[PDB]
Amino acid sequence: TRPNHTIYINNLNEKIKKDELKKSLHAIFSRFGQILDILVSRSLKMRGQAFVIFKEVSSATNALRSMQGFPFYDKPMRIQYAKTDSDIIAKM
RNA sequence: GGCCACCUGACAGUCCUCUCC
RNA sequence: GGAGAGAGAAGUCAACCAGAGAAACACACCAACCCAUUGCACUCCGGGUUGGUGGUAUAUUACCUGGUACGGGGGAAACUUCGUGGUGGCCG
Ligand SMILES: [Ca+2]
Ligand SMILES: [Ca+2]
Ligand SMILES: [Ca+2]
Ligand SMILES: [Ca+2]
Ligand SMILES: [Ca+2]
Ligand SMILES: [Ca+2]
Ligand SMILES: [Ca+2]
Ligand SMILES: [Ca+2]
Ligand SMILES: [Ca+2]
Ligand SMILES: [Ca+2]
Ligand SMILES: [Ca+2]
Ligand SMILES: [Ca+2]
Ligand SMILES: [Ca+2]
Ligand SMILES: [Ca+2]
Ligand SMILES: [Ca+2]
Ligand SMILES: [Ca+2]
Ligand SMILES: [Ca+2]
Ligand SMILES: [Ca+2]
Ligand SMILES: [Ca+2]
Ligand SMILES: [Ca+2]
Q1: Is-contact A48 A16, C-beta < 8 A?
Q2: Which in A36, A49, A52, A60 has the greatest CB count within 10 A?
């Protein structure tokens, strides 16, 4: 997609509990820039996926490039820019 | 006296309907 | 959301009333597995199995203790005793 503040991550290990997943995700993407929020749900349609909202688009980009395919909980991470702005960025 | 279905009724954390706030 | 009412599923129960009073079932939540899902969201929330926990279910229908209504005993009497849905079919 086109650059976005938020990156969409899928092909994540569905067995990891929400709290732990969000914490590890925060630990791995922290270095690219300030993270405004990380959204994760284990519902039928959202499981295996996560939305990491960066304060700066440039951070979404470096994070996406450097971490594409990163082995996370035994599965290579797939990353794309989110198709639309996350509410906090849009309502901003 | 027992066992199954069924009938009437008592009981009425889900759901539906109605009234009021 | 909340408060009433109707109906009523599941399940338990049976002469009626009252005091005590579980279980069953329904529902919700948690855990572990299994199945399904590769899904672009920002109003939580897939299914199944096993186990567990919970509620003005703080219910009421078993059971328990009192009386009430007919029946069977016994006793001068007083009174004291046991028993109390409809229907068909099948089991000695
Ligand atoms: Ca979780
Ligand atoms: Ca979740
Ligand atoms: Ca890790
Ligand atoms: Ca795996
Ligand atoms: Ca309710
Ligand atoms: Ca008001
Ligand atoms: Ca309210
Ligand atoms: Ca209410
Ligand atoms: Ca009713
Ligand atoms: Ca019934
Ligand atoms: Ca009671
Ligand atoms: Ca009780
Ligand atoms: Ca129970
Ligand atoms: Ca349940
Ligand atoms: Ca699974
Ligand atoms: Ca698909
Ligand atoms: Ca979208
Ligand atoms: Ca939205
Ligand atoms: Ca929600
Ligand atoms: Ca009798």
Answers
A1: no
A2: A52
Q: Which nucleotide's C1' is closest to A10 (Cα)?
A: C38
Report resolution (Å) to 1 decimal: 2.2
How long is the CA A49 to C1' C67 vector, in angstroms? 70
Distance A75 CA to ligand 17 centre (A): 24
Fold of A1-92: Alpha-Beta Plaits (3.30.70)
What's the number of CA atoms in the CB half-sphere (13 Å) around residue A50? 26
At CB < 8 A and 24+ separation, what contacts does A24-32 make?
Answer: A24/A72, A24/A73, A25/A50, A25/A52, A28/A67, A28/A70, A28/A72, A29/A54, A29/A63, A29/A67, A32/A59, A32/A60, A32/A62, A32/A63, A32/A66
Determination approach: X-ray
Q: Is the CB of A45 under 7 A from strand C?
A: yes
